Copies of this chain bind each other. A is one copy, B any other.
Amino acid sequence: SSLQASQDEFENLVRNVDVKSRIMDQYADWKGVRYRLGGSTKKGIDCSGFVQRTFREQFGLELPRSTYEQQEMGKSVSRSNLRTGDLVLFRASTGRHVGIYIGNNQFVHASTSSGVIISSMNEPYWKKRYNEARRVLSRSHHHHHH
């Protein structure tokens, strides 16, 4: 871990990735895949299996599977500081539904009705249900305050 911490640090520090571009690579590839609760393949996927799989394949970032657990990763983000690659969370029978912000008030998610899609945050259903956001892509800091 004392090599692997340096190596992990070095990777975060050199890698300047185009976050939106990478998310849309994944979306192009996964567009229209069906809803299956607990699924995580191209035969069917739920919202948080989609997030988990996206951040791993595209950013090498290890997120938990549970949406409860995904809602406590990284720092919370107010709505006006929203950036591409932030997890957007909604009160939506789960209680809790997660997508990825991709700018222009759009987000990418696995929905019940349509499978993997882009929606607008402004769509009445989601604006009522918008709950919070989390930043999980985040250059990790040298010294920490208490």
Query: Taking beta carbons and an 8 Å cutoff, which residues of A are in contact with B?
Result: 1-8, 10-11, 13-21, 24-29, 31-32, 41-42, 56-58, 60, 62, 83-84, 102-106, 113-115, 117-120
Once the chains are docked, how many angstroms separate the CA of A32 from the CA of B8? 22
By the criterion CB–CB under 8 Å, are B120 and A3 in contact? no
Once the chains are docked, how many angstroms separate the CA of A113 from the CA of B1? 31
Question: What is the predominant secondary structure among interface residues of chain A facing chain B?
Answer: mixed
- List the number of copies, as a whole number: 4
With A11-B24, A14-B21, A56-B120 as known contacts, state yes or no: A84 contacts B4, CB within 8 Å.
yes
Measured between beta carbons, the chain B residues less than 8 angstroms from A84 are 3-4, 7
Measured CB to CB, the nearest residue on chain B to A41 is: B113
Measured between beta carbons, the chain B residues less than 8 angstroms from A113 are 41-42
Known: A3-B16, A4-B83, A57-B114. 5 other contacts (CB 8 A): A3-B13, A27-B60, A29-B115, A57-B117, A60-B102
Once the chains are docked, how many angstroms separate the CA of A57 from the CA of B113? 13
By the criterion CB–CB under 8 Å, are B8 and A20 in contact? yes
